[PDB]
């Protein structure tokens, strides 16, 4: 099956909810340039016709490797909804 | 009433002529009846098969009638029944009214008769529908024969006796679905209307009256009868049957022969040697494969694909129009518009595609110039035209071209232009284009082919005859049936043909069983007596004995309970032959496959392709003109329903936004499905 | 050598004409005579080379569901028994080879009757290609290609005249394999293994030169296992 | 079309078919490599099948890595009626199928067709390969049990090699006591006399003869041709001198070696018995909820892959001489058949009424048949262990009880058009002839059987209609709802046989309160089942073995019932079922997930009259899905 | 309504432990003068 | 070089361990992979000589199912144990070396109990024998041979010491053989075998070691087919 998806669904207080996570972290993992990740330097995502996943194949594919991992933060109201934007673009580069 | 002639194969035009149905006129039954018609009366008896009714909704409603059965005067099926006056049985028959019938006290051809005589006290007749033991003094009337009892379409099966009426009913439709293969054969085994299933359909060519052989052309058998006249017969050579299986007429007489009135020039399309031919005989091994041939699914040897066996001729026919719009008339040119000539290579004639051209998806089969609007120009169409060459030919490419799916080589073309010979083209229509298209359709994976008797598979995986199940000599098993779908459904007969089919392979001959009185157990078991020697008797000689393998096999046989402990492997081997298995040896790994496997000459068929496998596949098209939803058509594949069933069990999972895309982005919101495939691109 | 390897492998061999060969060999050690058999099986049905028909040409047909005049053979049928013919040629140079031939008249057009080449050799004469009838024009060209294995005429599709026809080729010039394991008493112990495979081919090469070819495709297969990583 | 190597993760999705689903995915993809300057450049590229250079594959090939797709079967009857699976692109014109989850999807391989469609958003990507993927939905909506095990070909497998034989017993050797005992049938086993297998209680000389030290040593015999797999020999696995079959042995490791917790692989199989489909799906179960979900998907396949290959050596195969006939039946036959004559001579008189005849006989041959049945069995049970037929039957892969009967001893009472039953028995089998009135006989009830898949072939949705219709707002949403009236389960049951207590079946206790959540605690055999607590089915193992005890009769437990949320229920209340086994997640569609578990169990039901029944003298119930619609 | 369209789950954002120091640091740079 | 030769079989290795060894090599032609793995296989269990325990003779001990005072494991578990020794002999002149070992007391026989030999080694040395007691005598004598495959104690019968007692011979340092055809694509091609097979061994040879012998004896094989007769 899938990477550690009883871990993941174990992070999570609702089924459902992980879903969303997930697929909002691919959202912005995309969006604000793919390079808005907190795993990479030595053992994160990776796809063979050459090591080349490092750059842009499945989206959240990478949310949940991260996710299974201790970085992230997904709260009901974590981060107030438009001032969140905002800072991802000051901060991540590559449009 | 009416409908198109199911002409898939000879048998299916035979069978669909004789065949009745209720539904019809108004006066006559409908819809919200059926249950106590529906079901199989106790007058049906050499009047109607039970068993040749369709499968679903439709049941009971459309039958068709048994083999001897015949509308006399006015309409009553009557069925032929002989006389037997006193313990004596005739040879004279009364076509009987199902009424009369109740009247007398009627026998089944199954008693056993010296020829007059009737041979024994308490026998079988069954008077107006219950089934009675009557004494040979009371035995009024006999039965013709168990042929009478159902149609033509279900005598063809074998040994009916042993297959479980619901499931002989998925065979006799089978048949109905057999495609003639370039390579006919008729059966290792046939029941004895193969013949006449030929002769009286009208397949094979037939001789009037004796002679001498003229000319034989692949197109004309010119006879020379000897009453001083001769006559040409043409032979419908690749003719378009309404449902795209080929007609063709094979010569089967070399130039100078004697003709014996009523014997075979030509073969009809699936026809071996005037007898019926669905199908090909095929040595069969019946075990488990690598799951390949999990619940219904066959596994195939790709030797039976070098050898051109289970190909079939196809013909599809695409047309395309000329028609006429105020915008101005659609041109037929070898014009197309924008972009190649390598495009336009096989469009030789003119416009028209040339003959014996190969034709793959995509490629033009005719060329079409439409006008590009509907009523006005085009604003920024105008500046980029000019940009490079404002000079443009302003008309629309509409030409017909090969839909996904497949096309062949061109084989023939039909052109209508102006000043019409005796031709009706429509309004409109300013002229008419035909292409016909054949290709040879190879036996692929999911395919499907079936016996006679309802194993009804697809073919999942084309081995390499490198390593499927191998015999003691060389030679290799063509197909490997599971066993799995034969105790669930009750078929013992097809168990029952692959063992007379491995005496007949090694006996090089073919054999006939009767319905329901034919070959028996303990003849089998003889005939496979017989080809013990030719399998193992040309071993002794050729200069070899048994194997590790053939010793080892048998052990865990004998521990098993198949061969009785202390024979010699010699002797062993051939109580295990006349059980109708042998030892194969995994082409894979050499080594045996623990356990004798049966394995024999099943005659199996292939079916005809609806209309349905061309496998749909839509990314983005046309669309309903007032709702809104994908529609398909020529070319761009329609959109598959989602229907309520199938929204369920979305709203039963969590399927929140799949559910909304189904209804939203992908068939109905149409700013939706706009900025959905940019958004996409 | 006398004892343990002078009792090596007696290969002894049995061969008629081209076709069919058998080959023997024993005494083999403990469930060998299959172990050697089976791959041989294997490489003798897909890996040997071969020969047969790639495209045909006939005279005034442009494709293959035609019917010719005077010819009671349908060009299907007729493409279908070119599948049936057998040739060989001597060497390399010979890779591409169109046989011709032209018939006319109340004849039984044979496999001999296409016009000698030079390397190239027919070992099937009487196969059958047609019966003539008078007025019975027949003018073809028949390429034909050394390869392996099955290739439909789908997948090579071949082009020397804009009207030809391609045909399904069927290299492996084996048309079965066959052994038998079966024990041998020799003095000491009883278990022994006597491998004896019988091959037929369709005489393009011979049972023991495809025998040779297929053994050294093994021992080339058994190299590949040098250089570890 | 099956395809056997596929994971039920993946399934093989024709090319040609990708290109077209995932066209605008690789126009644009076509645009990052070399192989085409723009995307309407990038189409005419596709228009023409000739014109595409394969380079385009490889970037069809790469589009497609790591995202997913959905198949649908011809009757969307459950919501695993749809399935997420990863493509592998390949060859031709059919799907290439799992054939584990061939179970969920009623499919065959006779020409079924399975349409797929597209998840486009990064969105419906996410749910679609994260909580509808086939692998993740094992258990079913219906049922806790396992929807996903090895079915029809793989028992099979699984089932001969896991088998112990039994053979000739002449002389008496119950070797359990004498050392001559041991010595003297070990050299007459050498003889011809005693067999490898033969009942001498504790060790027949099949053990005697070999013993294993290591694992391995078991197996490396087998190879060499000393032991079948089939065979009882003994041998030392981790602290014991186990006597269990090579067979046996390997299967033991395949599990231990798809999960490497060994240990917690010996603790739950039961290698005391063939495997049958329950001792695997039993299996799979476990697996589940004691290892990890991936974990248990890896042993799914180890089965399926073993199975699957065991099979075909076993070389199990179908041949006129296996279905064997009883020699019980040629007598079963006549002394029904003279007491069929004694019925006659005691109606030629005037003692039964016309009825009392009619009624008396089918009693008759009701039994005989069923004594034949028994007998057939019987003598594969005695006789042939290893008989291709009963085999399937036996192990959980294919074979009825009434089906056997019906080739082997005899097919014996058909009913005529109406109902009432024909007073002639069919005394054929399907072995020899099953003859003309007998197939005509037969025929009757044939029709009536396809009359009645017709009338509801028709339309599926119609009793799931009213239940989604009347249920579908229902949806999980909760806090502990926290209005606790409850509900008591029974664990007894009255009237079949007037007043006679009595534990209540195996199963029906497992539907009541398999995974629910306790409303009050409960004392039961030592332990203390706390509130509030979820109860496994090992938890509802421990109720009904304490009610045998005798100390329970009922059970506090939540439910649906007795809910306080109006438009929802909660987690307490629902229980345990996601298809998952924890407790259920919120924000389930239980609704619908109820609506279909029940419109699907409906297709098996009778379809004879709704309002059931017919007004004639005293029809007195209603059977069949006529009733679950009255109710 | 009832899948993700849970208004329980309908809202639910994502963090990376950067993007959190720099809302801190929108918070820090509300003090005036 | 570059194409269909470079193109040539990866043999990649991966050995933890004189035990297992797993062995991978692609791309290879059509049911390659599987023509070569089983033959490998064949010969990795019977051909690959090996050594072990052949006969046992024990002090005052006459048949095989007794149990000596003193010691708590029976003669049965003890040859069972003995199976479980694997040794090692340098060359030929060692075909059957008899072990001796002579221990009382309380101690716990172990493998390295054994006087050494001078031509042989014990790699199974802390391997157990037998748990001693007091007035624990225990004097004997294990045979240890050269050989192939399994050998029933029923089939040799071995005979130094009338009282002693043969045991089953495990003389194959292959414990297990294990080979997988997976799919694997090169390019336009997508049908290709990659075999891979797995080899399990005791410790007296490796894997790789015996993987090497193994495709010998099978190359070996493929000469036995040269002079004719
Ligand atoms: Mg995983
Ligand atoms: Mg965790
Ligand atoms: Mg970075
Ligand atoms: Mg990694
Ligand atoms: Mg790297
Ligand atoms: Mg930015
Ligand atoms: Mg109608
Ligand atoms: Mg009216
Ligand atoms: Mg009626
Ligand atoms: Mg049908
Ligand atoms: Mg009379
Ligand atoms: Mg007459
Ligand atoms: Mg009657
Ligand atoms: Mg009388
Ligand atoms: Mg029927
Ligand atoms: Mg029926
Ligand atoms: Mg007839
Ligand atoms: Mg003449
Ligand atoms: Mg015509
Ligand atoms: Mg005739
Ligand atoms: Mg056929
Ligand atoms: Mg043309
Ligand atoms: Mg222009
Ligand atoms: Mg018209
Ligand atoms: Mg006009
Ligand atoms: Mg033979
Ligand atoms: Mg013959
Ligand atoms: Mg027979
Ligand atoms: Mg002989
Ligand atoms: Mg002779
Ligand atoms: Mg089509
Ligand atoms: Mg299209
Ligand atoms: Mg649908
Ligand atoms: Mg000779
Ligand atoms: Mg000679
Ligand atoms: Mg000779
Ligand atoms: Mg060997
Ligand atoms: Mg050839
Ligand atoms: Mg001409
Ligand atoms: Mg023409
Ligand atoms: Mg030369
Ligand atoms: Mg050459
Ligand atoms: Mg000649
Ligand atoms: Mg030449
Ligand atoms: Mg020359
Ligand atoms: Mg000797
Ligand atoms: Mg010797
Ligand atoms: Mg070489
Ligand atoms: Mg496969
Ligand atoms: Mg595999
Ligand atoms: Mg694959
Ligand atoms: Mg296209
Ligand atoms: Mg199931
Ligand atoms: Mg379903
Ligand atoms: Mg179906
Ligand atoms: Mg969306
Ligand atoms: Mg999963
Ligand atoms: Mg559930
Ligand atoms: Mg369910
Ligand atoms: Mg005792
Ligand atoms: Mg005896
Ligand atoms: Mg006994
Ligand atoms: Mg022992
Ligand atoms: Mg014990
Ligand atoms: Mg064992
Ligand atoms: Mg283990
Ligand atoms: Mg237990
Ligand atoms: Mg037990
Ligand atoms: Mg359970
Ligand atoms: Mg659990
Ligand atoms: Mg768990
Ligand atoms: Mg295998
Ligand atoms: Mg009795
Ligand atoms: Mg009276
Ligand atoms: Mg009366
Ligand atoms: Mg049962
Ligand atoms: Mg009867
Ligand atoms: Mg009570
Ligand atoms: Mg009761
Ligand atoms: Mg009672
Ligand atoms: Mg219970
Ligand atoms: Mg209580
Ligand atoms: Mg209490
Ligand atoms: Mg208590
Ligand atoms: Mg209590
Ligand atoms: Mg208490
Ligand atoms: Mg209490
Ligand atoms: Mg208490
Ligand atoms: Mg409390
Ligand atoms: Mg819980
Ligand atoms: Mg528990
Ligand atoms: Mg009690
Ligand atoms: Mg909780
Ligand atoms: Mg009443
Ligand atoms: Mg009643
Ligand atoms: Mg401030
Ligand atoms: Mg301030
Ligand atoms: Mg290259
Ligand atoms: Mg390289
Ligand atoms: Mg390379
Ligand atoms: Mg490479
Ligand atoms: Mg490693
Ligand atoms: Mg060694
Ligand atoms: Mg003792
Ligand atoms: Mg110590
Ligand atoms: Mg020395
Ligand atoms: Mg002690
Ligand atoms: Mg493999
Ligand atoms: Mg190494
Ligand atoms: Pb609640």
């Known amino acids: 099956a899938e990477p550690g998806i009883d871990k993941l669904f174990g992070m999570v207080d609702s089924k459902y ?60 109201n974590l981060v107030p909804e438009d001032r969140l934007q905002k800072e991802m673009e000051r901060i991540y580069p590559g449009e | 009433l009416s409908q198109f002639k199911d002409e898939t194969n000879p048998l299916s035009s035979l069978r669909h002529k004789r065949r009745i149905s209720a539904l019809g006129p108004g006066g006559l039954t409908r819809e919200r009846a059926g249950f106590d018609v529906r079901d199989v009366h106790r007058t049906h008896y ?9 499968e679903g909704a439709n049941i009971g409603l459309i039958t068709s009638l048994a083999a001897y059965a015949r509308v006399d005067e006015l309409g009553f099926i009557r069925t032929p029944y002989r006389r037997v006056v006193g313990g004596v049985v005739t040879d004279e028959v009364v076509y009987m009214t199902a009424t009369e019938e109740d009247r007398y006290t009627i026998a089944q051809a199954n008693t056993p008769l010296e020829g007059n005589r009737i041979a024994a006290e308490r026998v079988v007749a069954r008077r ?36 479980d009426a619901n499931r002989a009913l998925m065979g006799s439709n089978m048949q109905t679905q057999a495609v003639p293969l370039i390579r006919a054969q008729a059966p290792v085994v046939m029941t004895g209307l193969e013949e006449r299933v030929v002769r009286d359909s009208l397949a094979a060519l037939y001789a009037e009256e004796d002679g001498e052989v003229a000319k034989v052309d692949g197109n004309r058998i010119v006879v020379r009868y000897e009453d001083g006249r001769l006559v040409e017969y043409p032979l419908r050579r690749f003719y378009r049957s309404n449902q795209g299986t080929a007609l063709d007429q094979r010569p089967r007489v070399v130039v100078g022969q004697r003709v014996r009135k009523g014997d075979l020039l030509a073969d009809g399309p699936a026809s071996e040697n005037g007898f019926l031919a669905l199908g090909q005989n095929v040595l069969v091994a019946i075990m488990p494969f690598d799951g390949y041939n999990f619940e219904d699914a066959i596994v195939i040897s790709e030797e039976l694909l070098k050898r051109d066996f289970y190909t079939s001729i196809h013909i599809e026919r695409y047309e395309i129009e000329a028609r006429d719009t105020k915008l101005g008339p659609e041109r037929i040119t070898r014009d197309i518009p924008h972009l190649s000539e390598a495009a336009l290579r096989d469009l030789d004639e003119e416009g028209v595609v040339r003959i014996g051209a190969e034709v793959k998806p995509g490629d033009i089969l005719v060329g079409r110039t439409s006008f590009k609007g509907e009523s006005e120009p085009t604003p920024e169409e105008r500046l980029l035209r000019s940009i490079f060459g404002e000079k443009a030919r302003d008309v629309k490419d509409t030409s017909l071209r090969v839909p996904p799916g497949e096309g062949g080589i061109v084989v023939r073309t039909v052109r209508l232009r102006r000043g019409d010979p005796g031709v009706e083209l429509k309004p409109g229509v300013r002229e008419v284009v035909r292409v016909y298209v054949a290709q040879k359709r190879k036996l692929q994976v999911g395919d499907k082919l079936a016996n006679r008797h309802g194993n009804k598979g697809v073919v999942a995986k084309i081995l390499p005859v490198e390593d499927m199940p191998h015999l003691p000599d060389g030679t290799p098993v063509d197909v490997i049936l599971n066993p799995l779908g034969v105790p669930s459904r009750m078929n013992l007969g097809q168990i029952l043909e692959t063992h007379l089919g491995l005496a007949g392979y090694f006996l090089g001959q073919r054999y006939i069983s009767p319905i329901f009185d034919g070959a028996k157990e303990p003849e089998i078991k003889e005939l496979l007596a017989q080809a013990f020697e030719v399998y193992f008797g040309k071993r002794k000689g050729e200069g070899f004995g048994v194997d590790k393998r053939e010793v080892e096999v048998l052990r865990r046989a004998e521990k098993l309970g198949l061969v009785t402990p202390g024979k010699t492997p010699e002797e062993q081997l051939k109580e295990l032959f006349l059980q109708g298995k042998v030892v194969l040896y995994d082409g894979r790994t050499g080594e045996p496959i623990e356990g004798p496997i049966v394995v024999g000459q099943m005659f199996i068929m292939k079916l005809y392709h609806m209309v349905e496998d061309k496998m749909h596949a839509r990314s983005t098209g046309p669309y309903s003109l007032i709702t809104q939803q994908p529609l398909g058509g020529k070319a761009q594949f329609g959109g598959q329903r989602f229907g309520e069933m199938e929204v369920w069990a979305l709203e039963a999972y969590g399927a929140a936004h799949t559910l909304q895309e189904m209804l939203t982005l992908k068939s109905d919101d149409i700013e939706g499905r706009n900025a959905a495939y940019e958004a996409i691109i | 050598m006398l004892d343990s390897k002078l009792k090596a492998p007696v290969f002894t061999v049995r061969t008629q004409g081209r ?86 008249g109340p004849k039984e057009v044979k496999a001999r009757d296409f016009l000698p080449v030079a390397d190239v050799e027919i070992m099937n004469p009487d196969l059958h290609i047609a019966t003539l009838e008078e007025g019975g024009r027949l003018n073809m060209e028949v390429r034909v290609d050394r390869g392996v294995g099955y290739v439909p005429a789908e997948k090579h599709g071949i082009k020397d005249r804009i009207n030809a026809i391609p045909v399904d080729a069927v290299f492996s010039p084996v048309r079965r394999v066959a052994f038998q394991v079966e024990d041998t008493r020799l003095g000491q112990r009883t278990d022994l293994d006597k491998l004896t495979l019988r091959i037929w081919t369709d005489g393009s090469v011979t049972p023991l030169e495809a025998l040779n070819q297929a053994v050294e495709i093994l021992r080339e297969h058994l190299t590949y296992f040098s250089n570890p990583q | 079309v099956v395809g056997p190597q596929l994971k039920l993760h993946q399934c093989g999705l024709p090319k040609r078919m990708a290109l ?22 990038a189409r005419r590229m596709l228009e023409r099948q000739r014109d595409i250079k394969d380079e385009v594959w490889d970037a069809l090939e790469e589009v497609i890595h790591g995202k997913v797709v959905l198949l649908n079967r011809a009757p969307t009857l459950h919501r695993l009626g749809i399935q997420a699976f990863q493509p592998v692109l390949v060859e031709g014109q059919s799907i290439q199928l799992h054939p584990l989850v061939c179970e969920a999807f009623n499919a065959d391989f006779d020409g079924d067709q399975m349409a797929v469609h597209v998840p486009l958003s990064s969105f419906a990507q996410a749910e679609a390969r994260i909580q509808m993927l086939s692998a993740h939905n ?97 041998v030392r ?30 603790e739950l199989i039961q290698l005391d018995v063939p495997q049958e489909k329950n001792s695997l799906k039993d299996l799979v179960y476990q697996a589940f909820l004691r290892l990890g979900m991936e974990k248990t998907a890896r042993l799914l396949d180890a089965l399926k892959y073993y199975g699957f290959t065991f099979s075909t050596t076993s070389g199990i195969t179908i041949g006129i001489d296996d279905a064997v006939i009883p020699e019980e039946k040629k007598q079963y036959l006549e002394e029904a058949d003279r007491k069929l004559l004694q019925i006659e001579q005691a109606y030629e008189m005037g003692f039964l009424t016309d009825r009392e005849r009619y009624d008396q006989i089918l009693q008759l041959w009701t039994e005989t048949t069923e004594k034949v049945t028994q007998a057939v069995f019987k003598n594969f049970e005695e006789n042939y262990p290893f008989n291709p037929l009963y085999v399937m039957a036996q192990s959980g892969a294919r074979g009825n009880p009434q089906q056997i009967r019906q080739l082997c001893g005899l097919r014996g009472l058909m009913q005529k058009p109406s109902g009432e039953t024909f007073e002639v028995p069919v005394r054929s089998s399907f072995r020899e002839g099953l003859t003309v009135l007998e197939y005509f006989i037969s025929s009757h009830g044939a029709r009536k059987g396809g009359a009645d898949t017709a009338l509801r072939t028709a339309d599926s949705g119609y009793l799931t209609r009213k239940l989604v219709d009347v249920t579908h707002e229902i949806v999980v949403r909760e806090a502990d709802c926290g209005t606790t009236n409850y509900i008591s389960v029974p664990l007894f049951q009255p009237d079949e046989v007037t007043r006679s207590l009595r534990l209540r079946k195996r199963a029906d206790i497992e539907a009541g309160l398999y995974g629910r959540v306790l409303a009050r605690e409960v004392e039961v055999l030592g332990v203390r089942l706390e509130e509030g607590r979820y109860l496994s089915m090992d938890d509802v193992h421990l109720l009904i073995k304490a009610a045998e005890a005798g100390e329970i009769q009922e059970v506090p437990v939540r439910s649906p019932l007795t809910c306080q949320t109006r438009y929802g229920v909660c987690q307490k209340c629902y229980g345990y079922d996601l298809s998952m086994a924890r407790p259920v997640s919120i924000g389930e569609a239980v609704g619908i997930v109820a609506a279909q578990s029940i419109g699907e169990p409906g297709t098996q039901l009778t379809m004879r009259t709704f309002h059931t029944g017919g007004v004639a003298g005293a029809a007195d119930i209603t059977q069949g899905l006529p009733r679950v619609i009255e109710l | 309504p009832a899948g993700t369209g849970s ?17 801190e640091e929108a918070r820090k740079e509300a003090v005036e003068a």
């Open chain 4, 138 to 234: 094992l258990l079913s909506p219906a049922s806790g049990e396992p929807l996903a095990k090895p079915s029809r070909d793989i028992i099979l497998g699984l089932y001969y090699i896991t088998q112990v034989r039994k053979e000739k017993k002449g002389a008496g050797l119950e070797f359990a006591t004498p050392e001559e005992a041991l010595a003297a049938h070990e050299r007459g086993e050498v003889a011809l006399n005693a067999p490898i297998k033969v009942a001498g209680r504790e060790t027949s000389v099949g053990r005697l003869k070999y013993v294993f030290a290591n694992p391995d040593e078991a197996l490396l015999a087998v190879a060499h041709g000393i032991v079948d797999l089939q065979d009882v020999v003994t």
């Open chain 4, 20 to 41: 077209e689903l995932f066209k605008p995915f690789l126009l644009k993809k076509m645009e990052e490599k070399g192989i085409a300057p723009n995307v309407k450049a």
């Open chain 5, 7 to 23: 208004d329980f789950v309908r809202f639910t954002q994502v963090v990376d432990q950067k993007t959190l120091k720099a809302i």
């Open chain 4, 237 to 266: 696995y981790m602290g014991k001198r186990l006597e269990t079959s090579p067979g046996r042995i390997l299967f033991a490791r395949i599990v231990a070696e798809a999960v490497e917790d060994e240990k917690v692989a010996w």
């Open chain 2, 128 to 163: 107006k529908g219950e089934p009675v033991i009557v004494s040979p003094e009371e035995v009024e009337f006999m039965d013709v024969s168990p042929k009478q009892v159902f149609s033509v379409n279900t005598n063809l099966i074998p040994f009916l006796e042993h297959d």
């Open chain 2, 46 to 54: 050499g009047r109607i098969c039970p068993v040749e009714t369709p």
């Open chain 3, 19 to 104: 076709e069919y060969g058998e080959f023997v060999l024993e005494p083999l050690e403990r469930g060998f005579g299959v172990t050697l058999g089976n791959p041989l099986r294997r490489i003798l049905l897909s890996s040997i080379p071969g020969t047969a028909v790639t495209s045909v040409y006939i005279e005034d047909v442009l494709h293959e569901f035609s019917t010719i005049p005077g010819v009671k053979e349908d060009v299907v049928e007729i493409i279908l028994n070119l599948k049936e013919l057998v040739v060989r040629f001597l060497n390399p140079s010979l890779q591409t080879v169109t046989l011709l031939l032209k018939a006319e």
């Open chain 1, 17 to 76: 909810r992980l879903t969303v996570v997930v697929a909002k972290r691919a959202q912005q993992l995309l969006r604000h340039g793919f390079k808005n990740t907190v795993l990479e330097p030595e053992e994160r995502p990776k796809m063979q016709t050459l090591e080349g996943l490092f750059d842009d194949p499945n989206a959240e594919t990478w949310a949940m490797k991260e996710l299974l991992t201790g970085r992230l933060v997904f709260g009901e």
